[PDB]
Symmetry: D2
Subunit: 440 residues, 4 copies
């Protein structure tokens, strides 16, 4: 009910225009006082801010915009801080994907040796974001972080800053039930699923469209066509997410207990992913020539006074799900979202420091995670491997240990051998000088 | 959208006219096809049914009322079963309280040896209620059980019938929240608290009115006056002098242990000395409700049969009916209401065993309860729950395995019982007084 | 092997003449270079030391005796320190038992409010003994502590000094094993039992003499005459009859039947006064008769399997003999249904590097609930020592079974604070 | 008392060795009769010939009995030493052939080959237990040292929890033999702390006569591995594979510097180096056909003709002595501290209860008393948890007759790089093990 200072950490992001409009679509419920754009790359944010200035003009010209690179200005009296940083940028992302494919391992943004490399670049910058809000922001601030790797960052931030008023979320589960809703002619607001596992490492146990269970109806379709549908093709315009949503067919057919997350293709079938990818045109290269080009081109058109199509960025359930989390934090709406919380008994046969991705009711005081219970053996063993992998990686950043990171690389299902882990690790240390913590 | 068949298991209860009116007040949200009153005592239920018909005639005359003692006719195609049975009746309640006071122990309805005795009378009759609904009722039935002892029956029903579509609740925390509403001059709708422990064995960690945390302000008042305010005296529950003494005893407990606001029933566990002296062997609490709540509900039955006018607002008091109807209503429309229910732990409270039936906040869905991950509790409250959970656990094993030694272990474990020697003299006294109600113990 | 420096922490104890002789009997295995007596009451230690040298020269007059009160003197290059201290002495034990009987509670040395009060006196003096040896003693020293209350001391010292080279034992399980052997006509060295629980809070699950299990024959006799045989003890016949699974520890007569003990105890003549005018007075009169040249009987102190059990643990630490004993150890999964920081009393193999406890497994519900209550009771009392909290000490008093209510617990704790000023830590 | 000793699997190549090491303790083991039981009648009698001349040269007063009847061999049996290899030494070859056909490691106990070998031995082991509970002495003991000990011990405990069985393995003792040869220490004075699964553990501390030598061993093993100069003289180092396995541990000990690794970690941590090293037309299972199995059938033919046999070629290795010491400890209650396989149940706190871990324990006359070792670090918890789930899912596939549980188990295994490869390996193992594997719907 109070005027709120909304701060976007990483204003120069390609998702910034879409986030703002989805935040402006909920104006009558979120009392925006000042919309702040914060970033460490000034000239990059200035170009993206010109689109935000046009998104504000076309949707709500009364919203006051603020752009800065000083953390004191951006975070002083900050009420809600939606974090979406990419440490190193997309240029460092293709470096992670090239080194992995050079050694024959999968090169992904969040999975495999690439995601582990991206993680240790984001651990300490995220903690610095925590300390910024603890010093300057409101005493009851909130950091709705959806920057990747969510599994490693949430595990690192919980062990380093346990008292941080933070909520780590991901939209990949929301994107899957967006596909699941179209398979059934169901509307996305009427969908709801039970879920467990780590980030990019979970399963849909039960699905229901408006209270009526559905899991069997979806299981039959996904095992035959995957998460694609005849209406899905109308994000599905991207020729790479059509491969991911289709790849869920073989996984859901071999293991028939639950409906799988699309990120299981990189762990269950890494040999097929390696042959599918191309080191000369990695996914990061595909978005530099795609999403990032179309947002720089739109910034140049605004400078040239030419009309821009602002609906390029108003796509996906990405922005809608994040604003709902903020909206539930403001009015205590008790929204049930698949968020990432410390376990501490939520899943009994898992460790306490494990950051599981489970359903929880978003209160104004934080997430109230639902007690899930015990999980089967096949899913405990997979999570125990990744949880130890992520845990050894965090401990490598805390202790500045080379062996701890080497142990974490060997633990990953992507890395096939202890010898490959050492050769992959030594290449990342060379390519992350100035980003990674120094290992001894 | 679907017409529902609501069955009140135990229609001859003193709370039956209350919850019937509280159920009729939600007529737009609960589509009542028929209202069924089931009981094993035909004559007692027919007298209460006279008042239920008078309540129906006053609030909603379009609701058809069916009264029966046949379980197959009562539970066939049943949609929602609200259990409020008292195995042995108030007759056995005064005998449990008198036997305890005869041995210098706290004789309470649900706490101490009287509660454990009342529990063993209710285990198998509750299981028979479950098998009735599994066999006769709808495949999506729900048993909103609020019969006591809710702690023992929930742990027993979960072990014997784990697949039962049952939800065990209690109004004692809600009644405490009503007092906290009066102390703060806050509306009960705006109240919400964090809570953990067992039934009649819990603690309020945080309490907030309209989202604003008011725990520190409440414990300031409770430490000096207890759960009693000057506006609390105006309501109907605080008319009973036993409830005034019961709420005002929380001042000592909230002053010695300053972490949380205690549940009211800690009066008998933490202070059995001050309770054995306060109670009267010749006028126990069960005797008081016989000369009070039970007397005034069978008087109104005779007044109805004599044409004299009956004051129906006698039984419309308390948050008893309002809380139980809200649970069923949240089961029908999937309202996701956050209530303090009794669920199997299974990691909800990490320091406790899996089969511990803890009383924690949960969201009532049309599929059951989704309990929130409470986490770890400090040492002083773990050790207290570990003792009672072992006590209640050994008592459930005594009913299943028919073991006399497990029952002696259950009585020895309880905090009310001072020694194992008193536990045997009390147990053997309960064996004879409950011949016909208890399971055989070899 | 190496000539070792044996130190007795508490030379003014009434047990010192017995421990010394039991240690001299194993002189062929324990290479003693000099026997030390450490204490803080040099007036009391010098009188008991007169009995020691007379025990020395009547058993082995070639070992060197040393009597000092300087902590650096006694613990420098010390290889084995045998702690038997009693903080407050026997003059405060009588006050712990009188205060409990003032409120109608169990007035015992180690069980109830008397035990918790005694435990709060021994925590920090024990920590100081640890820090004395960590800097002055040998880097592989071993502290064999058997000073009560072992349950509260072992839990407090393990949380405060986790890396302490300490072994907490108790002869009460061995004394029961002695009376068991007398029932079965068995040699004490041939008896061996499986055991679990807290110190003075455990049970005998299986007992065997010469390999043959004799549990059923024992509990037949113990249910009739208790642990007493034809060749406190007799009270265990009721406990073994009401609960038929295991053979109980004798100390369960205070927790399972507290009010029955209160009717048996006389406040004007407590147990601590029986030893004042009994064991303690026979030690000082013996030292008095030694000072006057009167011939003394040194065999009156040689009684008991008390000293022989503690020497056996030390000998097993020296030569790595793998002696299986009932030792108080940190749980950490030895009993699954108990917390990690629970100090369980389970059989373990005494090695040259410490005790290797056997994995016991899960215990049934009735014994878990009783242990969980006492473990939380002792855990809260230890937290009251570290955090200096009056509410934590009140919580621990309320948790104890022998306390009828929290009302009596507050009146009981307040009386203990009045009588233990100078021994207890501050409680805000 | 007089004891009836039964060797389950008399046709084994280790039968003459364990008989020699059993007769060396004839004063500590009162042997009433020595029984050789097996299902292969023709194979056992040939191996029984060597056993007849072993007893002739050592203690000709021992009564020898051969049979193929379980009621004859197991009635009144006091101690049974499990030694079976169901399917034979040639089904082992096809395990190591199919694995290398898909580019995976082909090992007797590790990878898809060991999981396949395990599924063959689960129900035969359950039948051996039910044979003894029904026929043998009421206080019988089964000293099981037949592989895969990890999967068998987990399956036998979940199916027969009250079985009087003790699962052991000489691999830690074979390493302890090598460690003793590096430090000029005697094997009787060696003693080590150890945790993990069977062929999946780590040596945390090592002592020679009670003095820690772990840092001194790490200095040598990180350079030459478990290979030393005195080790070469031993008969096991004359095999070219057992030298490559003991020197391969140099890298694993150099990368993970916490503990000394079990030599079987080369198959889990290095599936690239092993598949490159293995020859598909001459696997380890083939090297024992024309190697160990040829030297024992040569000796069996030498006896029936009259030619005197050299029996000391079967009298090498810590395998037999370590097994006889365990059974001797059960008879006289010697409390021998051995590295055995027991149900966890809190022994390793941060592991599941049904996990069968390999930890030190004191062998009494009533079973093994394992020591409480506590929690293990994160890197070693995650590795064991993955293998524990792998072996757990494989045991469930045997009990529940589920094809999906088997596919889940083959996918969890570290040596299998993909679910696609896990499905292709499982389908080939099903066809090759028809009649040995249970049905998988
Ligand atoms: N979890 C999910 O479901 C999900 C979905 C989409 C995007 N994301 C995350 O969104 C982020 C942005 O993606 P993008 O394609 O727009 O990236 P981008 O590289 O185009 O932009 C990232 C922005 O972050 C800024 N930044 C970098 N380090 C920073 C720091 N320490 N503090 C503040 N700002 C910093 C950069 O300067 C840049 O402006 C990534 O972390 C991505 O993984 C996550
Ligand atoms: N959960 C709580 O906090 C809470 C609050 C109020 C009441 N209660 C419980 O409500 C119940 C009723 O209280 P009351 O004072 O109105 O009781 P009451 O004695 O006046 O009436 C109880 C009724 O139950 C019937 N009954 C007994 N055994 C039965 C069986 N096996 N099947 C069906 N009906 C059976 C009796 O015949 C009688 O009609 C008690 O169990 C009481 O403890 C619980
Ligand atoms: N656990 C068992 O099985 C077992 C058996 C018998 C006795 N005990 C305990 O062992 C101890 C034996 O002593 P006792 O009963 O003969 O009493 P005691 O009073 O005769 O001797 C205790 C000695 O401890 C000394 N002391 C006090 N504070 C000290 C400190 N800080 N450092 C060193 N010495 C200190 C005293 O001055 C005195 O000399 C007592 O605590 C007794 O209860 C335990
Ligand atoms: N400590 C260890 O872990 C260790 C050490 C050495 C050998 N082993 C195991 O020893 C076993 C034997 O090795 P080997 O090379 O001598 O084998 P082998 O092939 O030479 O002999 C195995 C014998 O088992 C018999 N057999 C098969 N099924 C049987 C059944 N159901 N009951 C009884 N006997 C049966 C066969 O007929 C054959 O005679 C293998 O399982 C091997 O892995 C393990
Ligand atoms: O019947 P009474 O003794 O008045 O009890 C009144 C009731 O108060 C609350 O509702 C408690 O939760 C019940 O357990 C109790 O029965
Ligand atoms: O001191 P007493 O009354 O003689 O007690 C006899 C001794 O035996 C008990 O078992 C305790 O271990 C000692 O604390 C006690 O001193
Ligand atoms: O490869 P092989 O010659 O058959 O020997 C293999 C054997 O050697 C190791 O030392 C292990 O102790 C055994 O478990 C294994 O089966
Ligand atoms: Mn994501
Ligand atoms: Mn109640
Ligand atoms: Mn003692
Ligand atoms: Mn082996």
């Amino acid at each position: 009910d109070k005027e709120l200072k909304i701060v976007i950490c990483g204003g120069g992001s390609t998702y910034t225009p879409g986030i703002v409009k989805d935040l402006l679509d909920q104006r009558q419920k979120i009392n925006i006082k000042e919309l702040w754009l914060y970033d460490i790359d000034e000239e990059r944010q200035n170009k993206v801010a010109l689109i935000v200035k046009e998104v504000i003009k076309t949707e709500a010209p009364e919203v006051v915009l603020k752009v800065t690179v000083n953390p004191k200005e951006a975070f002083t009296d900050a009420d809600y801080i939606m974090a979406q940083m990419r440490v190193g940028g997309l240029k460092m992302r293709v470096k992670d994907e090239q080194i992995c494919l050079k050694h024959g391992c999968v090169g992904q943004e969040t999975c495999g040796a690439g995601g582990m490399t991206y993680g240790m670049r984001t651990i300490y910058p995220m903690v610095q974001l925590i300390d910024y809000c603890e010093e300057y922001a409101s005493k009851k601030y909130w950091i709705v972080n959806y920057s990747n790797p969510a599994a490693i960052v949430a595990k690192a931030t919980y062990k380093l800053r346990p008292k941080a008023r933070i909520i780590n979320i991901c939209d990949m589960p929301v994107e899957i039930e967006a596909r699941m809703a179209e398979i059934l002619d169901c509307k996305l607001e009427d969908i709801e699923s039970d879920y467990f596992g780590l980030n990019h490492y979970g399963w849909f146990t039960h699905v229901r469209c408006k209270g009526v269970d559905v899991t069997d109806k979806l299981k039959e379709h996904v095992r035959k066509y995957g998460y694609v549908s005849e209406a899905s093709m109308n994000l599905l315009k991207d020729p790479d997410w059509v491969h991911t949503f289709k790849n869920s067919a073989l996984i859901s057919s071999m293991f028939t207990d639950y409906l799988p997350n699309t990120y299981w293709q990189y762990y269950l079938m890494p040999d097929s992913i390696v042959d599918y990818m191309d080191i000369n045109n990695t996914r990061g290269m595909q978005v530099i020539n795609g999403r990032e080009k179309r947002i720089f081109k739109a910034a140049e058109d605004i400078r040239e006074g030419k009309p821009v199509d602002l609906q390029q960025f108003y796509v996906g359930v990405h922005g809608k799900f994040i604003v709902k989390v903020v909206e539930s934090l403001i009015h205590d709406e008790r929204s049930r979202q698949l968020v990432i919380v410390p376990n501490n008994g939520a899943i009994e046969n898992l460790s306490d420091d494990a950051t599981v991705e489970i359903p929880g009711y978003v209160t104004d005081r934080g997430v109230e995670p639902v007690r899930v219970g015990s999980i089967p053996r096949f899913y405990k063993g997979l999570i125990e491997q990744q949880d130890a992998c992520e845990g050894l990686l965090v401990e490598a950043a805390i202790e500045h240990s080379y062996e701890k990171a080497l142990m974490a690389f060997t633990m990953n299902r992507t890395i096939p051998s202890s010898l490959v882990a050492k050769k992959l690790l030594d290449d990342m240390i060379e390519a992350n000088k100035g980003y990674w913590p120094e290992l001894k």
